[PDB]
Amino acid sequence: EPLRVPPSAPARLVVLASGTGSLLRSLLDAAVGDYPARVVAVGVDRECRAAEIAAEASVPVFTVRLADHPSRDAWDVAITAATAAHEPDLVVSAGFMRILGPQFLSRFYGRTLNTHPALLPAFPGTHGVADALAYGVKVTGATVHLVDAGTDTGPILAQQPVPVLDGDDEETLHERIKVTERRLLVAAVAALATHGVTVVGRTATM
Amino acid sequence: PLRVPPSAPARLVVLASGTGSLLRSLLDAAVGDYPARVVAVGVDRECRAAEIAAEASVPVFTVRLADHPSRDAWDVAITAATAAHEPDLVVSAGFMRILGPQFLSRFYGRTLNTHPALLPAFPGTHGVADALAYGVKVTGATVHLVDAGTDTGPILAQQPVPVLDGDDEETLHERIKVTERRLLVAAVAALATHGVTVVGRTATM
Ligand SMILES: CN1c2c(O)nc(N)nc2NC[C@H]1CNc1ccc(C(=O)N[C@@H](CCC(=O)O)C(=O)O)cc1
Ligand SMILES: [Cl-]
Ligand SMILES: [Cl-]
Ligand SMILES: [Mg+2]
Numbered sequence: 001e002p003l004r005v006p007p008s009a010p011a012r013l014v015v016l017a018s019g020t021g022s023l024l025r026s027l028l029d030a031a032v033g034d035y036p037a038r039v040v041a042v043g044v045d046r047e048c049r050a051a052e053i054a055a056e057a058s059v060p061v062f063t064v065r066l067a068d069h070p071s072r073d074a075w076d077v078a079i080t081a082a083t084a085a086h087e088p089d090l091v092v093s094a095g096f097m098r099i100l101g102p103q104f105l106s107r108f109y110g111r112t113l114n115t116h117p118a119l120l121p122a123f124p125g126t127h128g129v130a131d132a133l134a135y136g137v138k139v140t141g142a143t144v145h146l147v148d149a150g151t152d153t154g155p156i157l158a159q160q161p162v163p164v165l166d167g168d169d170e171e172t173l174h175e176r177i178k179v180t181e182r183r184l185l186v187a188a189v190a191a192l193a194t195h196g197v198t199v200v201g202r203t204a205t206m
Numbered sequence: 207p208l209r210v211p212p213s214a215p216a217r218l219v220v221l222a223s224g225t226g227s228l229l230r231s232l233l234d235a236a237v238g239d240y241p242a243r244v245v246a247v248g249v250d251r252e253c254r255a256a257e258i259a260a261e262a263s264v265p266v267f268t269v270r271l272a273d274h275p276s277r278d279a280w281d282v283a284i285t286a287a288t289a290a291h292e293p294d295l296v297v298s299a300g301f302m303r304i305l306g307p308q309f310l311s312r313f314y315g316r317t318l319n320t321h322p323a324l325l326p327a328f329p330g331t332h333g334v335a336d337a338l339a340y341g342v343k344v345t346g347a348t349v350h351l352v353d354a355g356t357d358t359g360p361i362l363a364q365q366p367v368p369v370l371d372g373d374d375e376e377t378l379h380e381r382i383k384v385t386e387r388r389l390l391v392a393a394v395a396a397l398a399t400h401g402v403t404v405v406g407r408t409a410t411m
Contacts, residue, residue: 126399
């Protein structure tokens with residue numbers, strides 16, 4: 001039946017990343033004072049700006065490279081162990097570019113989240129903003145959701161709409177979506193720490 | 207259900223054994239907004255593909271079959287020589303050896319090839335001579351994922367090419383390479399941008 005993830009405040013948070021680190025930056029700025037989590041480590045699979053931002057904020061960085069393990073299954077086993085060594089309560093995938101495998105999700109399903117710049121299940125994939133623009137919707141949005149076995153498929157945690165303006169291009173639309181995407185992620189992490197989450201079918205309530 | 211994630215901007219290693227014409231189409235395309243870069247070329251022999259790779263200042267590694275004690279040993283060594291460049295995609299571009307189970311155990315799902323016939327018709331190394339001898343009126347090119355030995359992995363992209371009266375092997379092969387070059391460059395970009403999902407034998411990007 002249901003999956004219950006208990007409250008965890010003050011939460012130990014692990015961010016997984018491969019890219020720019022801007023969501024990472026958004027989470028480091030917010031996790032101060034009474035914010036009910038702290039970033040305890042950043043995991044990357046390659047040298048990247050996110051690793052740099054993490055080190056500059058005195059956050060431990062662990063690296064697990066696909067090229068150092070004999071296959072995808074063994075990499076899944078190793079990322080899982082390197083992440084567990086930090087005992088997180090929550091894992092944010094923030095620009096991470098590897099699919100999290102069966103072993104990782106066996107351990108961290110319910111506690112792992114991702115953000116997407118459309119109102120899932122509309123516009124999944126890497127071109128969510130450009131697609132929403134080509135499709136001619138007037139309303140798009142940002143989604144935070146639990147990571148499951150598929151990509152963009154997990155139980156939804158929080159959503160907020162964002163208008164498409166006349167004459168918007170991709171860039172101007174994307175930046176508008178990113179403003180909301182950042183707040184939504186920050187609020188979702190706090191809420192999961194404070195209240196935990198229950199999942200019935202595919203529906204996630206705090 | 208095989209799922210390979212997007213990798214743009216992707217690190218490409220191209221493996222080659224011959225002319226380097228497919229390779230050159232990739233080198234020329236893979237700049238700017240193209241969602242990938244060629245980071246290394248691997249060859250199992252001296253060939254024009256390796257020379258073309260040095261002209262564009264791309265590192266070349268060479269793993270010759272004769273330099274190892276067994277087909278198995280060669281397979282381990284080429285896999286390691288490739289993994290060293292941390293590729294996101296491995297493109298087989300006139301590469302003349304079966305890629306072994308060790309290579310596929312690391313790279314299956316991320317390895318692709320262009321074949322000058324419309325698979326499953328005319329597989330193997332003489333797909334063009336075979337298509338001609340059979341007397342088909344429509345042949346083509348197929349970009350597909352590479353799998354175990356002779357087997358054809360999920361088809362990524364295909365495009366047809368007419369056989370014309372009086373064609374010989376050469377003119378027909380030249381017509382198909384024109385389509386191969388475009389199709390490969392388009393498929394690498396799509397694979398890099400979108401990744402791939404496989405249901406049954408069917409691949410979607
Ligand atoms: C979060 N998501 C995910 C998932 O949903 N489920 C599993 N099991 N594992 C994972 N791991 C990470 C991710 C799936 N893979 C990827 C990998 C790469 C991209 C990608 O490069 N996206 C582009 C922008 C497009 C986007 O918003 O996805 C980028 O900003 O980098 C997008 C998704
Ligand atoms: Cl709105
Ligand atoms: Cl035709
Ligand atoms: Mg995303």
